[PDB]
């Protein structure tokens, strides 16, 4: 009842406009909502609970497939029920092929500790940040993302370096990073996207955030990230991606081409142009697809990793059956 109306409000907020802007807020709200779902709805066996979770997660994902934090948090919860059921009652590999009613409290405590560990991902990333920045380095970022801004603005407490931020047109939110970071004395620079390659030779390394990392190591980021990665590969400069663990989602690029997110073309082309708006077709995607071959490293709350290892993290977070959801 009350939980149902809260779920409906959450779905409507996702459909219209994200209230809690930070992805961490999305993860915390999704986990809390799943907590009241588990506590309130009645179930005898784990199967009906799993299918109810499948239905609710399907509804929430269908509300807005552009962002996948809700989806992979739901998948993590489903794996939590699977693990708890296997523990209280009793991974695909060649070894497997050759060889061969009180869990509610355990589920609740698992979700609680998941929230506790999710709280400190930013702090862990900041703690390990200092080992990848040396004095008088040149760093370039794209758009706005709180992870990398915390990264740099804490790693500059003991080091001095230069930072270049390219505005992510049309949503010129790189200016926000520039202002916030220059309010910490970092000697930053504000730049357009069209100049990326023009300056890319004189950059030591490039650190970027992301919105979602796929299974193959390819990621979905803000528009223009693919061009930056291509320039990096051309100049062979290392590329660092700062992404917490919950931004890892088990889908794959070729899925119905509902991958990008197209917004109103008002930002790209103002409505004041007039007559020419009929014969002209305008596209304003907000996300770009970066292949895994252009990525050098992954920094998460657990440490450093290579893209070629990303698949393993998939097996430790999501059961293969719950990919389709």
């Amino acid at each position: 009842s009350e939980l149902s109306e809260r779920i409906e409000s959450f779905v409507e907020t996702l459909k219209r406009g994200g209230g809690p802007r930070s992805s961490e807020e999305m993860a915390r709200e999704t986990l809390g909502l799943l907590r009241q779902i588990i506590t309130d709805h009645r179930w005898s066996n784990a199967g009906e609970l799993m299918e109810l979770i499948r239905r609710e997660g399907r509804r929430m994902t269908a509300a807005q497939p552009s962002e996948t934090t809700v989806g992979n948090m739901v998948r993590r919860v489903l794996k939590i029920i699977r693990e708890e059921y296997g523990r209280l009652h009793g991974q695909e590999s060649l070894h497997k092929l050759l060889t061969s009613a009180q869990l509610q409290s355990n589920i609740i405590e698992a979700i609680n500790e998941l929230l506790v560990e999710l709280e400190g991902t930013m702090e862990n990333i900041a703690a390990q940040a200092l080992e990848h920045i040396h004095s008088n380095e040149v760093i370039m970022t794209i758009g706005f993302s709180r992870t990398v801004e915390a990264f740099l603005k804490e790693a500059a407490r003991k080091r001095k370096f230069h930072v270049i931020v390219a505005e992510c047109a049309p949503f010129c939110q790189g200016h926000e990073m520039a202002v916030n970071l220059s309010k910490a004395g970092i000697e930053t620079t504000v730049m357009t996207d069209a100049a990326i390659f023009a300056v890319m030779s004189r950059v030591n390394k490039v650190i970027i955030g992301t919105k979602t990392i796929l299974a193959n190591g390819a990621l979905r980021a803000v528009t223009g990230t693919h061009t930056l990665a291509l320039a990096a590969k051309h100049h062979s400069t290392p590329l660092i991606v700062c992404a917490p663990m919950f931004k890892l989602s088990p889908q794959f690029p070729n899925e119905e081409d509902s991958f990008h997110k197209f917004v109103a073309p008002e930002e790209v082309l103002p409505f004041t142009e007039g007559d020419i708006l009929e014969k002209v077709s305008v596209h304003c995607p907000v996300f770009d697809y970066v292949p895994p071959e252009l990525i050098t490293l992954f920094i998460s709350n657990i440490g450093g990793n290579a893209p070629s290892y990303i698949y393993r993290l998939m097996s430790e977070l999501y059961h293969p059956d719950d990919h389709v959801l």
Binding site: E167, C172, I186, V190, D193, L269
Partner: protein
């Protein structure tokens, strides 16, 4: 003498050697209204350059040549002097002032060199009126053969490559590309055009206004989304502001990005440029020779707040506004000139044959 334009705002350390002025600060505030340095063919062109009333390289060259035609017409020799040298010695301050208003381009450099050579070639025995008339005629012939006939020949050449049912990608406001596409569409070619624009000038809309006025189907998008649209793109066609002896292409900031992503997507790249735009000087990057425009154009109004409003009050904050960049030759597959369809590596060869 003419004063020196004050540099506005702090600059990036890597770009400390380049000047950076502001559109608000006009040098004419420190010059006589009845121009006493020399006749005011200076100030009209200098103001239209500094304020950005004329942007196209061909437009800049044509305006400069018209202004210098007026200079020659109004010029008179001083007694006990030779025209062939006094004219150039007097013309050098015009170039200094024009550079102060806004740095010159390769096309204008070539025009100045050509006119200086023409003035030097003028004999010391011929009469004043004959010399002035022949200088004006030489300027007219240069304009004709180096712009109009060159554009027509380049359009005829490009008509071969443009096939039916393909997609052609352009960039920015370039007169040559727009004329090529319009003439190709005139001859019955049926195709689409994809327009890529970039902040802060946003001059790409210009060519869009042309394309609809020519009835050509078109599409418009910003530069960062180019990687999204290239898979359905069949050809990329770019205008160039200059060609260097090493085969590199000096052009607007986004040109190199488009070339690199097109190569990464396996798409042929065409560069259309006139022979007179070829420059002998060479460079390997955009840092050694560029031009920093007014950084105040970078400010944008998102929502109800401008993030970069008081950027001057942050000591650590820096803004750069590049206007030019260098595309390496290995990413260029064509140079389309009146001489024909050549590879980039043959750019110096043209410089050899047109020099004599």
């Amino acid at each position: 003498q003419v004063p020196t334009r004050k540099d506005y705002g702090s600059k990036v350390s890597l770009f400390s050697h380049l000047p950076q002025y502001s559109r608000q600060n006009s040098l004419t505030q420190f010059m006589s209204i009845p121009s006493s340095v020399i006749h005011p063919a200076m100030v009209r062109l200098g103001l239209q350059y500094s304020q950005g009333l004329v942007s196209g390289s061909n437009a800049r060259c044509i305006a400069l040549l018209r202004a210098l035609q007026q200079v020659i017409q109004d010029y008179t020799t001083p007694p006990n002097e030779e025209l062939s040298r006094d004219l150039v010695n007097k013309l050098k301050p015009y170039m200094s002032f024009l550079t102060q208003c806004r740095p010159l381009s390769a096309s204008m450099h070539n025009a100045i060199k050509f006119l200086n050579k023409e003035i030097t070639s003028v004999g010391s025995s011929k009469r004043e009126e004959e010399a002035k008339s022949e200088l004006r005629a030489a300027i007219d012939r240069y304009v004709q053969e180096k712009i109009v006939l060159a554009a027509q020949a380049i359009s005829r050449f490009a008509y071969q490559k443009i096939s039916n049912g393909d997609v052609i990608l352009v960039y920015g406001c370039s007169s040559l590309v727009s004329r090529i596409l319009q003439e190709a569409w005139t001859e019955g070619r049926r195709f689409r055009v994809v327009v890529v624009d970039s902040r802060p000038w946003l001059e790409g809309r210009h060519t869009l206004r042309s394309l609809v006025h020519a009835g050509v189907p078109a599409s418009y998008l910003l530069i960062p989304a180019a990687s999204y649209v290239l898979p359905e793109v069949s050809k990329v066609l770019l205008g160039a502001h200059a060609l260097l002896a090493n085969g590199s292409v000096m052009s607007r900031v986004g040109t190199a990005q488009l070339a690199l992503v097109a190569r990464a997507h396996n798409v042929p790249v065409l560069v259309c440029c006139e022979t007179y735009k070829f420059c002998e000087r060479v460079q390997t990057d955009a840092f050694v020779s560029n031009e920093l425009d007014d950084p105040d154009d970078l400010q944008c109004k998102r929502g109800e707040h401008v993030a970069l409003a008081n950027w001057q009050n942050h000591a650590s904050l820096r803004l750069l506004n590049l206007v030019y960049d260098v595309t390496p030759p290995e990413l260029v597959d064509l140079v389309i000139t009146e001489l024909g369809m050549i590879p980039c590596s043959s750019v110096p060869v043209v410089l050899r044959v047109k020099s004599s």
